[PDB]
Amino acid sequence: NKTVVVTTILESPYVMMKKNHEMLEGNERYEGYCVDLAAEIAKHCGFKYKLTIVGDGKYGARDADTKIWNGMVGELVYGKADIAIAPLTITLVREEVIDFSKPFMSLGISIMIKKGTPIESAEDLSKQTEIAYGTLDSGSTKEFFRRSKIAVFDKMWTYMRSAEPSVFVRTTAEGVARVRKSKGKYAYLLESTMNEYIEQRKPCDTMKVGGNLDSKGYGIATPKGSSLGNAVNLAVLKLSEQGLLDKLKNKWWYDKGEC
Amino acid sequence: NKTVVVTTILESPYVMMKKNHEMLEGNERYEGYCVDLAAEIAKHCGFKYKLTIVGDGKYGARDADTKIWNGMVGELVYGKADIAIAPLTITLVREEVIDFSKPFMSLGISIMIKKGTPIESAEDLSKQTEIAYGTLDSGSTKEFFRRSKIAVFDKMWTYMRSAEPSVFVRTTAEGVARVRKSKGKYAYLLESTMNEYIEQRKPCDTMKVGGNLDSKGYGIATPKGSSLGNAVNLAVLKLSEQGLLDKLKNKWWYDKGEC
Numbered sequence: 001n002k003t004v005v006v007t008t009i010l011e012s013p014y015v016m017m018k019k020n021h022e023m024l025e026g027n028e029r030y031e032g033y034c035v036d037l038a039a040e041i042a043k044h045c046g047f048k049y050k051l052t053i054v055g056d057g058k059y060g061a062r063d064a065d066t067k068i069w070n071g072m073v074g075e076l077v078y079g080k081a082d083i084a085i086a087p088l089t090i091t092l093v094r095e096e097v098i099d100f101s102k103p104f105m106s107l108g109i110s111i112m113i114k115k116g117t118p119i120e121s122a123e124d125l126s127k128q129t130e131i132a133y134g135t136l137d138s139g140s141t142k143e144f145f146r147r148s149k150i151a152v153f154d155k156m157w158t159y160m161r162s163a164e165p166s167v168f169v170r171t172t173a174e175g176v177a178r179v180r181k182s183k184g185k186y187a188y189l190l191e192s193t194m195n196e197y198i199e200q201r202k203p204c205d206t207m208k209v210g211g212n213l214d215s216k217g218y219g220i221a222t223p224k225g226s227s228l229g230n231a232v233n234l235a236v237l238k239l240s241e242q243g244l245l246d247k248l249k250n251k252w253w254y255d256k257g258e259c
Numbered sequence: 260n261k262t263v264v265v266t267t268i269l270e271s272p273y274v275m276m277k278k279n280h281e282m283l284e285g286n287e288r289y290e291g292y293c294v295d296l297a298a299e300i301a302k303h304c305g306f307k308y309k310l311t312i313v314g315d316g317k318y319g320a321r322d323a324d325t326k327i328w329n330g331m332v333g334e335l336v337y338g339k340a341d342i343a344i345a346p347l348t349i350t351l352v353r354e355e356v357i358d359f360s361k362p363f364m365s366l367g368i369s370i371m372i373k374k375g376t377p378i379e380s381a382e383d384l385s386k387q388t389e390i391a392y393g394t395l396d397s398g399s400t401k402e403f404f405r406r407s408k409i410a411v412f413d414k415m416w417t418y419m420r421s422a423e424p425s426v427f428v429r430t431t432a433e434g435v436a437r438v439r440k441s442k443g444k445y446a447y448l449l450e451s452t453m454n455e456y457i458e459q460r461k462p463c464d465t466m467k468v469g470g471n472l473d474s475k476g477y478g479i480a481t482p483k484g485s486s487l488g489n490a491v492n493l494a495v496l497k498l499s500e501q502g503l504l505d506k507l508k509n510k511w512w513y514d515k516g517e518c
């Protein structure tokens with residue numbers, strides 16, 4: 001056996017640097033839902049592991065020209081990591097190049113506003129121009145809009161793709177900060193899981209509005225045909241059935257609530 | 260190529276006999292969410308197929324003594340069908356013997372009451388004895404209670420397992436009828452998808468109460484190592500991303516609403 005290299009991403013409350021731990025070593029530096037999940041998966045599957053943060057800070061997309069995968073997906077595709085344990089969305093284009101476990105969490109695209117913003121739905125956003133809106137610049141949310149044939153979402157993409165200045169952000173934290181600083185003139189499209197987390201964080205000035213725009217899941221990813229895929233998949237189902245995933249959700253979202 | 264034998268189950272609104280079609284032939288007899296899903300899967304995967312209703316009318320469980328699988332799971336395990344396209348819950352014990360696609364629908368165990376029943380939650384059910392409650396006698400809901408280590412659910416199982424007369428039912432329709440006829444003295448534990456469907460059916464006398472007790476998914480099942488598994492899995496993701504699964508949900512639940 002060898003130590004399994006885990007790629008993950010700094011995304012609250014999934015993986016966070018513990019206060020004042022920057023200069024410590026190894027796995028103990030990090031906390032969060034995916035840190036606890038990695039420990040359980042590794043225990044059930046009988047492996048030792050090293051948590052690493054994805055070098056480019058991205059989830060994963062294929063460049064249109066170079067055909068090269070970036071982010072966590074790229075780390076798996078090019079053999080830089082053995083497994084990705086992160087809020088990584090199961091998508092068709094990714095499933096074509098890596099393997100996913102059954103989902104460990106359900107989510108959908110959602111709208112985050114600064115409280116008091118006169119927006120209730122995606123339709124509302126699409127029918128006005130005063131309030132700008134965008135997504136994480138690389139990720140499954142952007143791709144959702146890029147590919148949608150649904151009238152409202154196609155309209156939103158036509159606006160977003162050419163809006164100036166760019167409505168896209170490099171990180172979730174950047175999108176949240178942009179909502180908070182924009183006096184109601186920027187809304188952020190992000191996954192319901194993140195949105196619901198931030199809604200319960202100080203300064204308690206954002207909220208989720210409207211229903212989810214889609215329904216999907218996060219999965220644990222391994223390189224195609226990995227020795228780990230089968231056991232990891234069975235482990236996710238065991239964690240689900242043993243109530244552990246619900247325990248972790250309660251721990252990191254609502255037990256954490258500051259609002 | 261050969262005609263693919265599809266096993267499914269008569270369960271509204273997934274697969275229903277069209278009015279006055281009992282004496283007709285082939286696939287045209289049936290309608291419902293899973294009928295529409297089967298047509299899309301078959302189109303994307305490039306196969307012809309025959310819809311068949313599971314002979315024993317069960318979802319699938321392994322007998323404790325004989326070790327034999329019944330229901331749709333058994334039809335796959337013993338080679339009687341090529342694929343199951345039905346509201347078949349993804350579970351660990353099933354995943355050990357058959358393959359599941361990524362989920363096509365999200366659901367959780369839920370409580371159905373006759374309107375006016377003084378029950379708001381599973382905790383409420385567990386803390387009283389006036390109102391009886393039970394599950395489908397063979398299925399993932401029964402197994403959930405049989406295996407739970409959560410205090411409230413363990414208490415409920417201890418009651419259900421020895422209650423007389425039996426609190427278990429052979430079919431969802433039987434559980435719904437039992438709620439409707441029992442003057443508030445029977446509550447039925449069933450999947451949220453079914454519960455939400457029935458809530459919108461005449462005579463509009465039942466309702467879903469409380470949050471879901473768990474979170475899981477339905478998947479399309481194939482025998483272990485089937486030639487169809489890979490393509491079916493990719494097809495489910497395509498249907499999800501193309502908004503087709505959302506379209507089918509709206510079609511069979513809410514466009515169907517009678518209340």
Ligand SMILES: O=C(Cc1ccc(-n2nc(C(F)(F)F)c3c2CCCC3)cc1)N1CCCC1
Nearest residue numbers: 090103104106216217361362363365474475476
């Ligand atoms: O498996 C359960 C719930 C759950 C159920 C279903 C999904 N997923 N996951 C997908 C996905 F495969 F990602 F596209 C899709 C769904 C339902 C909607 C169709 C596409 C996702 C999640 N969880 C594990 C622990 C908590 C939630």
Ligand SMILES: N[C@@H](CCC(=O)O)C(=O)O
Nearest residue numbers: 059087088089139140141
């Ligand atoms: N979970 C997403 C990143 C967040 C987003 O795109 O909103 C992904 O796997 O790409």
Ligand SMILES: N[C@@H](CCC(=O)O)C(=O)O
Nearest residue numbers: 318346347348398399400
């Ligand atoms: N979907 C369930 C049947 C319904 C239930 O158990 O409530 C199964 O696959 O076993």
Ligand SMILES: [Zn+2]
Nearest residue numbers: 018021028029
């Ligand atoms: Zn420490």
Ligand SMILES: [Zn+2]
Nearest residue numbers: 040044239244
């Ligand atoms: Zn465990």
Ligand SMILES: [Zn+2]
Nearest residue numbers: 163164165166
């Ligand atoms: Zn620009």
Ligand SMILES: [Zn+2]
Nearest residue numbers: 277280287288
């Ligand atoms: Zn007809």
Ligand SMILES: [Zn+2]
Nearest residue numbers: 299303498503
């Ligand atoms: Zn299609």
Ligand SMILES: [Zn+2]
Nearest residue numbers: 422423424425
């Ligand atoms: Zn009895």
